[PDB]
Amino acid sequence: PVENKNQAPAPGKHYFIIENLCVGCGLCLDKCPPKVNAIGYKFYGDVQEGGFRCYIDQAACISCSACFSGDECPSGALIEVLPDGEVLDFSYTPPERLDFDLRFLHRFHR
Amino acid sequence: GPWSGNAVHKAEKYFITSAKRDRDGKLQIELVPASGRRKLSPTPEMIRRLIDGEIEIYILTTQPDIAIDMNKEIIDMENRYVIDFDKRGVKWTMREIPVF
Amino acid sequence: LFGSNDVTTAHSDYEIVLEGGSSSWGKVKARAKVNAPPASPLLPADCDVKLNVKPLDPAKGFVRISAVFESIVDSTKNKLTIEADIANETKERRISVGEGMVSVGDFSHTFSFEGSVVNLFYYRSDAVRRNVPNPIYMQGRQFHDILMKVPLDNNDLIDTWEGTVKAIGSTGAFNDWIRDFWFIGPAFTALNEGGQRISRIEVNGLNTESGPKGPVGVSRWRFSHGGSGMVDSISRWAELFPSDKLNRPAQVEAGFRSDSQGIEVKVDGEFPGVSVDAGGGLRRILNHPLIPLVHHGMVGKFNNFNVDAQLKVVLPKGYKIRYAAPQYRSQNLEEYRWSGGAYARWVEHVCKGGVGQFEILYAQ
Amino acid sequence: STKWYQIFDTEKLDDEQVVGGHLALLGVLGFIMGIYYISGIQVFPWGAPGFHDNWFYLTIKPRMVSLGIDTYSTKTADLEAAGARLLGWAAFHFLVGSVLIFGGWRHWTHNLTNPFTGRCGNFRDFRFLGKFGDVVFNGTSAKSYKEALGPHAVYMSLLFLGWGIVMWAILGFAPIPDFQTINSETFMSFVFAVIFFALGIYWWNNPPNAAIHLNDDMKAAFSVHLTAIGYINIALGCIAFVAFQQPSFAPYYKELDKLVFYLYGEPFNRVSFNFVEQAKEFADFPAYAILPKSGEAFGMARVVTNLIVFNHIICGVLYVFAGVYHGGQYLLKIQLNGMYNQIKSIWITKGRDQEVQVKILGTVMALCFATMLSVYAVIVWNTICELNIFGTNITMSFYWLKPLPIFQWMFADPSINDWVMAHVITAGSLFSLIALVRIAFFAHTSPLWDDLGLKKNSYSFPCLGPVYGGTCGVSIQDQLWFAMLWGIKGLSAVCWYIDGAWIASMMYGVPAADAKAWDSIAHLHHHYTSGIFYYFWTETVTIFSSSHLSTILMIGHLVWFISFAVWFEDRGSRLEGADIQTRTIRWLGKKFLNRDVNFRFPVLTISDSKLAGTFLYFGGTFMLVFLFLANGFYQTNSPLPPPVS
Ligand code: BCL
Ligand code: BCL
Ligand code: BCL
Ligand code: BCL
Ligand code: BCL
Ligand code: BCL
Ligand code: BCL
Ligand code: G2O
Ligand code: SF4
Ligand code: SF4
Ligand SMILES: [Ca+2]
């Protein structure tokens, strides 16, 4: 009989890099502001065999997190340590899955 | 297979935090996977996984060195540390700040 | 025109290869791909279940089962392995001695258990078995006397054991509230939704013993699992246990992979109790246990779906199909394939938890 | 990094946004069609001459002839009627395109208000029409692409029925089932209306489920539809080539050879340095006026057929490549998002296992290598035999190798040329499919990058550095560029075959002996224009004759060898050179400027350098292939005699 009013428009930090893992691509350098210059190349030997790696100057590097948030690392050397101590290779790693294939017996994929 | 989990790592990459040598040896050595959401302990089942090859634990450098002479003292190249003294362990090296 | 649009689709295949003669063996291969979201609060759940079983010497019986569950849930790895010798002492009692181990993520513990399960129907009337061809509902109750021993090698085990020791003495309502703990998730809902009732456990005294291979917490407890009649674990005690049919080892390699967009189920298995003899010389595929159907009904009614289901009963050359309702779609000389129409309706019925019959009677 | 080619990316667009974009594009396309129709007015209805036969209109023309428009008439009155119909239909296209642009703007702003009735139409929920929508659907597709296929097919059925009606009333083509004559396309339009209405109602009552696309439709559905429509466009090109060669289309295409055309840029009558218009070659035509180019010699019928067929074919191949690339982008997105393990459909789960990817790509590579080696050895051996080096006459060549008699039905004159054409098309298809499969399967990790611990984290990353002495061009964008470069060969084979050329050998028709004796020993009633290398020499006669085609030649060549600069591994050299350029431009200081020169010389990123390189490479290549197809057909039905009896 009686009802109340309604409206509803719905309907109608201290980042580190593991030189053992790093391969020296330098996208961290591109992700770093030029004013800081924290990422730097360190040369070890022949360039074609891996050669140079990259390093962070902890004093110069002040909590930008652009490198890791960009998630551009192919090698996973760009790691982030946390105040509690956990280490991150990637911002979000895919979950590990128990992989086993599906083949219907009567369907064409058997 | 490779797409499940972090695609870089063949085995589950378990970094070792600097939990060490502060109270009766600190047997609760912190093992953290690459995912990093959980923070596990080095129970014998984790050692079973590690000897199975499904997971692999790695020691980092830029931290208080984790029982570096109490876990194992093989220092031929400073990276010959093994848990059960026949492990074939691998250490991650980071001379981050000390190098130019 | 039509109603209930925007339905998802589930594609399912089943194959039951029966064995002729007095052997009631069957080979069940099932596949399923459902595009409906799963009801997992920790959604990315993939579990592989390897249920092997071997005939130990039948002088006393004690067939040996070996179950390996490996479940990755939210990128958490769990594994439960149990190897146990089980034997029907008498028709009503069963005695088992086994070992096992759980291992979640990092924490693992091994247990050695012995168990006496006395199953009694609330009634055994000659008139009922005289008047009904097949009693699917049967009222009864199980009494489990379980003695489980766990070495307390890990500190987590020690803390939990101390907590349990304090709890069993500080609170008498523990015997009740342990049931509240006994159902980790919606299993408490499935208990009453499935017709099962669980009585308060009666502790016979859990004690620690000093073992050379680590200290062992040895807990003896008995609990009563009463059934309204839908419970396969009670009403079908004669079944569930190939006491004399295990003349050969049997296996199951089941598994599922569940994630935000779908569910992928693959079952391979060889079971010794697929076929049940019936009166008049007829043999049938065993009546579906109703606890699976009902417990699946809770999650099966969460989305509107259409099913494309096929089933092939590879019948032995010595038998001809009978009394198949729904009827068979494709008729081979020996095989019989059910698909579409009424069978699809039955699949949609049992996917949502409907306890319906699919009578398939094969005879000479 | 959002660039100027990422602002219109679908990830930032909604469904209504792309609806508005498609409608704006349809309206702009209608405006362009009006431009072309006006450009086809041979004699103005005012009583004056018209436009000089644009290639756009020369392509559009036969289809217009199929309709009541655009009579093939030299009679001035009927040609004026043709111009009147063209202009009227152009104005109608202009009006409809204006309304379509208005609707596209309304859907771009998400501002859907009807001026006559002040109500707001919800994009998520509405009725298609006042009563028809309630008759058929009773509502709207619930914001899911799978539920929209039904209504989309119903709309397509409506459009087919409307096309039949337009043919029935305005263009005066009564539907009869005689498929040889024109007046059955309307009957088939009605048949397709019935069929697609049935399909639409079925798909509305029963929506097909491929749940991969629904979530991120903006890329998954885009990729699937783009690849499907690319294959559809390839099929349309093939069907067009077959049909335009049929006698049924002959009244509408062979008559194009009968009539001459005055093209824009076609050479004019040349006046001398002293022409007193108060000496002139071809004095009958006025000064600086276009000399007529005869269709019979130019082969305008097959020239227009080739333009249409290769336009659709290359557009389809490019659409296939772009569909694969955008599907790779979506797959990379779900691989970084962790949804790749959660798709649960055959189109992904089969490729989820890396060993299956290895097997598929290895099978493709083996087939490509085998077919390519076979056909290339055949080609080079034919060339060797016809040039007689190493003392081999053409009797040792692959002239015996005809297509199988069972398979001979689909060729005019069975020869090694058709064999090599088919084998080259299959080899190039598999050659591009190698890179397409690489995009499909290796968007995140290749088996090498699985063994060597790297992974692709972007769709436009340049490389991974000099580690392992490589890592160049493993991005799906770079694999797309390689696929395009590899399919350039296949598209070139298509163009040269449809234009008419001996692909089975390289120098066919050169003054060498056994090159000329090919036709004598092959028994062909068709004289193919020339061999692969001699094709340029034989077909650039007209390209040089026409100043306009020469201008296109020069511009395309410039574009190509400018692509060279960004294709090579020279970006760092260009960067340091640009820094030197900037330093000297700063040295314009103390050259009396007193102005701070804040102009850093820019150098493209590698992800942008490859983009520009491929765009300019393809652009120059096929700007020149346009001249290949605009030189002429120049195929005479006369076998060559042997040089020596
Ligand atoms: C929209 C409707 C959809 C659908 C939507 C869903 C949804 C939604 C869910 C499932 C779930 C499942 N579905 Mg489904 N599903 C459909 C149709 C199917 C079809 C088919 C097409 O034929 C199949 C094969 C399946 C099969 C399955 C399983 C893979 C899975 C339940 C696992 C289970 O048994 O755990 C067995 C579980 C237990 C036994 C409970 C364990 C815990 C309790 C506390 C302890 C119990 C007692 C213990 C075991 C006793 C041990 C000791 C004794 C000595 C033995 N569904 C229909 C078409 N499906 C669920 C799933 O697992 O999601 C990941 C789920 O959430
Ligand atoms: C699940 C429904 C009932 C139940 C009904 C039964 C039945 C029925 C039996 C037992 C038996 C046992 N139960 Mg119980 N039991 C339940 C709850 C429990 C709980 C608990 C969750 O707290 C515990 C600790 C126990 C404890 C135990 C043991 C004392 C004993 C042997 C276990 C063992 O061998 O398992 C080994 C573990 C498994 C093999 C894991 C998988 C379990 C599933 C149900 C097996 C499915 C079989 C499949 C359909 C066919 C397989 C073919 C393969 C080829 C083998 N029950 C609930 C209340 N219980 C047995 C007995 O009486 O022992 C004396 C027995 O016959
Ligand atoms: C400890 C558990 C109990 C027990 C509990 C049950 C229960 C309860 C049931 C059976 C059922 C069956 N069991 Mg039993 N059963 C026991 C002992 C045995 C042994 C043995 C000699 O060890 C064997 C070989 C069997 C064999 C069989 C068949 C007679 C029958 C299934 C026929 C069918 O077609 O299956 C085809 C079935 C499959 C294709 C699906 C298998 C699915 C998965 C792999 C197993 C079921 C459990 C759950 C869904 C998954 C794991 C959950 C937790 C991780 C434990 N049981 C032990 C002692 N068994 C079922 C039956 O129909 O009873 C009449 C049933 O409901
Ligand atoms: C055969 C029909 C094809 C198709 C042909 C085209 C064409 C042709 C065009 C689009 C355009 C777009 N299409 Mg589409 N597209 C298809 C399928 C889809 C699907 C899908 C099924 O999921 C989606 C979501 C889209 C989404 C989109 C957007 C990226 C964009 C329109 C929105 C916007 O406002 O742009 C904002 C910007 C504008 C509308 C105009 C910007 C200025 C100019 C006109 C852009 C021209 C680009 C380029 C030169 C087009 C060349 C075609 C080649 C000559 C062969 N397409 C089907 C299968 N689509 C246009 C777009 O912008 O492409 C990048 C466009 O050019
Ligand atoms: C230029 C023609 C354009 C166009 C231009 C406009 C303009 C302009 C307006 C809308 C309006 C609306 N448009 Mg529109 N729109 C087009 C195609 C679409 C499509 C589609 C089929 O994919 C969608 C989803 C929409 C979405 C919407 C609706 C939410 C809304 C009308 C509400 C309703 O109940 O109206 C019932 C009728 C509709 C759903 C119309 C559907 C489109 C038809 C084909 C064209 C209508 C305009 C046309 C000039 C009139 C003659 C049509 C012929 C008789 C077929 N448009 C066509 C291709 N549309 C109107 C509005 O917001 O209304 C309140 C409005 O003012
Ligand atoms: C649509 C965007 C532009 C536009 C751009 C073009 C383009 C571009 C072309 C024409 C051409 C034509 N235009 Mg128009 N034109 C528009 C508006 C109109 C309207 C109108 C009232 O909206 C009409 C009646 C016309 C009239 C016509 C004809 C004079 C002529 C031939 C049509 C025909 O064969 O269709 C055939 C009709 C059908 C096949 C059925 C309707 C469409 C179906 C539902 C979609 C599937 C078919 C699709 C077109 C081809 C894909 C085949 C695959 C196998 C799936 N234009 C708007 C403004 N117009 C053509 C031209 O001049 O030829 C030389 C031409 O190619
Ligand atoms: C056949 C209809 C469509 C088609 C419909 C779809 C659909 C639907 C999907 C894709 C998707 C993808 N498409 Mg496709 N796609 C086609 C043509 C292609 C071609 C090509 C040049 O032939 C390529 C390289 C691609 C590329 C791709 C990938 C980016 C992606 C699949 C990755 C994967 O793991 O695949 C694994 C490989 C396979 C499953 C191969 C086997 C294919 C089928 C399922 C099995 C039977 C066919 C049999 C092998 C061949 C013979 C019989 C045929 C009838 C000829 N498409 C045609 C045009 N494509 C998916 C994606 O995510 O899009 C963004 C997606 O959702
Ligand atoms: C017409 C074609 C080309 C140019 C035009 C040109 C311009 C140019 N280039 Mg180039 N290039 C190739 C072709 C052309 N490169 C090829 C095919 C390769 C493959 C190997 C290649 C590769 C490298 C490497 C590796 C490096 C460079 C540079 C460098 C310059 C710096 C200053 C200089 O040399 O001026 C000398 C050059 C000029 C006088 C060019 C300006 C007018 C011009 C006369 C012709 C005008 C053409 C017109 C601009 C086209 C369109 C007009 C209209 C539509 C807008 C510089 C002006 C680099 C440096 O910056 O220092 C040298 C460097 O490191 N390159
Ligand atoms: S966190 Fe900031 S300062 Fe440190 S390397 Fe990254 S961008 Fe440079
Ligand atoms: S992105 Fe990774 S591989 Fe590249 S330089 Fe940084 S740490 Fe090294
Ligand atoms: Ca030519």
UniProtKB/TrEMBL annotation, chain A:
Residue sites binding [4Fe-4S] cluster 2 per the record: 32, 61, 64, 67
Domain 4Fe-4S ferredoxin-type: 13-42, 52-84
InterPro entries: 4Fe4S_Fe-S-bd, 4Fe4S_Fe_S_CS
UniProt xrefs under PROSITE patterns: 4FE4S_FER_1, 4FE4S_FER_2
Xref: Gene3D superfamilies: 3.30.70.20
Pfam families: Fer4_7
Annotated positions binding [4Fe-4S] cluster 1: 22, 25, 28, 54, 73
SUPFAM superfamilies assigned to the protein according to its UniProt record, in alphabetical order: 4Fe-4S ferredoxins
Taxonomic superkingdom: Bacteria
Name of the featured protein: Photosystem P840 reaction center iron-sulfur protein
TrEMBL record, chain D:
Taxonomic source organism: Chlorobaculum tepidum (strain ATCC 49652 / DSM 12025 / NBRC 103806 / TLS) (Chlorobium tepidum)
Residues the record lists as binding bacteriochlorophyll a 33: 152, 225
Record: residues binding bacteriochlorophyll a 32: 152, 225
UniProt-recorded name of the protein: Photosystem P840 reaction center, large subunit
Residues the record lists as binding bacteriochlorophyll a 26: 106
Positions with a binding annotation for bacteriochlorophyll a 38: 213, 347
Binding site for bacteriochlorophyll a 6: 8
Record-listed bacteriochlorophyll a 15 binding positions: 22
Residues holding bacteriochlorophyll a 34: 152, 225
A Pfam family this chain is assigned to: PsaA_PsaB
Residues that hold bacteriochlorophyll a 40 according to the record: 312
